[PDB]
Design a protein around this ligand. Sequence first.
Ligand SMILES: [Cu+2]
Ligand SMILES: [Cu+2]
Lengths: 620, 620
Amino acid sequence: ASPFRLASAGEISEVQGILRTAGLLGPEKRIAYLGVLDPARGAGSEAEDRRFRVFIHDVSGARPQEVTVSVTNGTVISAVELDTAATGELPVLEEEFEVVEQLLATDERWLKALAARNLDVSKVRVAPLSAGVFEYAEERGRRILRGLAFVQDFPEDSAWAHPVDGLVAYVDVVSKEVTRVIDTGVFPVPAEHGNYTDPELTGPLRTTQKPISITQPEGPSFTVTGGNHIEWEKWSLDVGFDVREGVVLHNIAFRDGDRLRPIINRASIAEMVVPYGDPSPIRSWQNYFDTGEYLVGQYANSLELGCDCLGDITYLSPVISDAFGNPREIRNGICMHEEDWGILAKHSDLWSGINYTRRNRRMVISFFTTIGNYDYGFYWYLYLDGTIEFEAKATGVVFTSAFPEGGSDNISQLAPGLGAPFHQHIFSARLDMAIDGFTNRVEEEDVVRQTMGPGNERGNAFSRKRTVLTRESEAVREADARTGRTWIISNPESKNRLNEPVGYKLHAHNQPTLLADPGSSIARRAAFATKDLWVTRYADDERYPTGDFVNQHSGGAGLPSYIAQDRDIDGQDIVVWHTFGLTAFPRVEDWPIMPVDTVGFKLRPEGFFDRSPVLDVPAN
Amino acid sequence: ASPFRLASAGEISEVQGILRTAGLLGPEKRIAYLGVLDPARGAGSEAEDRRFRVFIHDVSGARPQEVTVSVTNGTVISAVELDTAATGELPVLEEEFEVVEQLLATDERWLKALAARNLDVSKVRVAPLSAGVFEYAEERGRRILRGLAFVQDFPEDSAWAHPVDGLVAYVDVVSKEVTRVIDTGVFPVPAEHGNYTDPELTGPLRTTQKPISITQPEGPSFTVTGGNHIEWEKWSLDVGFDVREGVVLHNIAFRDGDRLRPIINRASIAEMVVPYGDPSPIRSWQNYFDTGEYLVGQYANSLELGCDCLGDITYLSPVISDAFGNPREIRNGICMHEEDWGILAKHSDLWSGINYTRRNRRMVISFFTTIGNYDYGFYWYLYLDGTIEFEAKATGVVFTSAFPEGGSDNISQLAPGLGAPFHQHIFSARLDMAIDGFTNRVEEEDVVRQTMGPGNERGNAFSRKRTVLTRESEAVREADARTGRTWIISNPESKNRLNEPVGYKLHAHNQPTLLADPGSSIARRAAFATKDLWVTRYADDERYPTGDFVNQHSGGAGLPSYIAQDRDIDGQDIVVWHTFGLTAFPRVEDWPIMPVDTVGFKLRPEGFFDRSPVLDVPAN
Ligand SMILES: [Cu+2]
Ligand SMILES: [Cu+2]
């Protein structure tokens, strides 16, 4: 049917069969990544060719492969062997995580470190984290995970309350060897528990909260067809799901009278990095690329009705591949519902005597994922007026350490002896723009202050200026909140009735970007995070700001390599990459479980319509 | 009852009686402002002296007076004559607004201007706008209103669609004379109508919206006692209402276990200015001080259930005085309700096997006001986790002009020949802080980047720095979104369990502040708007950032005068004044009626609690 439909279990099993048939999926092989590819530019739904891209790992140590298969045709389009030391290791396999604690449990260096702290190895949990790229030459070409220890006093104990500082181990998860065990010294292991369900800590629960019932007597206002095609209050789009990116929105368009007008061809969070700011050798290598290294979509939670998603909810249960190519469904992994959004427009006119009030609503598409101690909610919103917005919600348990006696400039104290290293959560939203079609351009708009004098005698005038970004070399921009800087994406060949190119304006939150020193490993690997906005010429192999292979990969791929091409982006098929994130200085209020904090961005129509598109909304 | 209870119709009638009796309310007198006075500092004497402040205007031209009465004692405590040329004119009376159109209708200069444009005088509405202080010496000491014309084709027609550019009149509303009639030239009067309820313009109304029902089967979780005292999920406060400021929050406190801990003594929007950036002499004098000159609370709308406020709503019908001292009730002028706010905290822990999810909710207190063409919603929110937030919603009809032939650097085109001059909506939130009591201080916190080198070999470290504002001469601060600048209000004598001064952190949106040239009249009169944050030592007579009498005041009043005192603010009774606003370049989408746009700020606990204050919230 629609070439943008979600991958089905049958297609995944067929990809497995095709790879097996081609001799690419024997018993030593593991699927590190599997996802359907988007239709090519100009397909137009004419003859379907559902293609899947797969990253295949080999547990025996043989070189991995990147393969594209046509599930429709039963063929292997391409299969290439990867030199990982050069182009990057494949994403971490869920199976490699447990390996770390298992191997360390019998390592004498690890056991000696634990004994020095009087810790029973059977109660020491180990957080198996991505390794990054540092000074360890022996790691080049190997799949390494670094382990940090946490004591779990009993089965239901929250280990995060008991970090074991001064200790870290590096593990080769393929050869199953502990390569290094570093012990910088013993630190008291924080003693207080962080069991948020322990009545001793919570105290009696509140009996003061009365129920809030949200229902839709006649059902929702949106329709779902072809499994994932949504139609809602003039909007039209397809909800896709990729194991790496999570929820992806395709073909976002608005029905303006007689015509379906495209706005965004594809919107996704193409990368998210969590860099830690504690200079201690125990954690100075810590940087999670949840999307690129871990694949956020595979850890999507099954959302429960009532608590996760309240109201009249329509669920999608995406299917992904397990490590052997078998299909696996994430039951109720995606929530879809519409919610009241206060007042849309209101005016009580004295002269006419007409009082007018209209209510707003927004379509919500979301999912929630869990990566170790953190849990993240990804929310996309569509409003009646044409506004498009994204919001990330960060919660879970803060990553802990010991709090240094005598304080710290890079760690905050949460409880007696318990510290929380400073860090950031930075996202990259990749927006493949299609404002009224693919001929688009981007202008940076700044508010312009004017000097009092001739032509502005009262010194009250203020204006604005727009600078077209013509080539990729001048398309890497920074925020300027002071001058109200925004970026407008327009179609120079599609004009509204006032003869102005139709457009959409991107409003950023202007939060701090990557703080790390520019010469650090993280500044190079997460180069995209150092600038607020990047614009590139569309290319089918430029999917992530960090490249296809992020795990233990140095700089050399991603955005900095794409924009160097210096392609024409003035009235062309373009892609906007917006960096936005939160800078965290954990508070006592964030312990033992942190309340949701948020960050995001939105785009509002800018002369896209000929007048307000909500005049036809009825009084409710 | 409480000293913070809302004024009763009876108390207002009592002030009228007291004034009449003292001979201060003769036939030529008009009450330009009347409001209850807040209890003085340390008034734990239960004497209860309910005092009201009144500004009395004299239509015969006699000097106005500021009178303070005690309704408890039935006496006049004070009555001072005002020298308006020195201290500013009194707020514009709603009755003086009519005067402008009426006087102009028989003025020959005005009729001559309309005749040249072939406009029927009976169809020309005149917007009676505040005058400000410019180069007109003959205006000092006089109550002037400037008028802009708009054509209304029929009774139910939206006149805003038909501005009459190149024409402006100045009127002395006391002597009832037209002082000037400037006609810079003829501009075509925009022809299209902007009647948003006209089927010809709206088209067939949508039939796609299905109902969203929000109910509370057991009633709300908040309690209202003493008419305006609110208790909700640990929060405690008193909702006041003033004709100038609108909704005012008093004694915001949080019950932390055994004790009621104060956070903010008084919160209000103490001023709101709308400066226009069109250098045309027809409008270069235009700056509305909605709060100071017009009094936003007096124009509060009567909210309708289901339309304006959805769900289980509890209303407050505040009483204000009319121009003669008679009490007038604003029926359903304040909405109070609690609403679901998605996920509060969530974590699915692999090691403990515990999956935890909790919902968030916020208590909302709001009102909506209409000032001419604009309608504004003021919303205060209290969250479960201790966060306090304010949000202003701007809607209504855009103030129009002609769109110049050849375009404009200071006006945008909305419809053929129809222009929208650029402007800003800037607010000032006055927060009389009481973080665990009145001994408070403020620190400006900036993110600090670190250089790679000794102690930071991997170049990953980042920190934060805090600078205490010790005196008022160093308490006028600007935003710095780039370094994640925020301001923390703490109590240096109240420490949490980790022995750190308890505090709250103010997160601003970092929108542009006043754009006008620094030497302009508006920069002087609305100096508060040129900077993001001001901190002053509390004083009962420093109520507004622009002073007590904003109308036609020459400049320098309010904040710049207060801080010039250079008082000690390091661990003293202090007040934080936060400037925040929207900079507008009206779009075609804002015509014929604009969709809501928003701006605000929020404060989050910063080591105020000893751990998360929401561990006792039960499961859904
Ligand atoms: Cu965090
Ligand atoms: Cu506006």
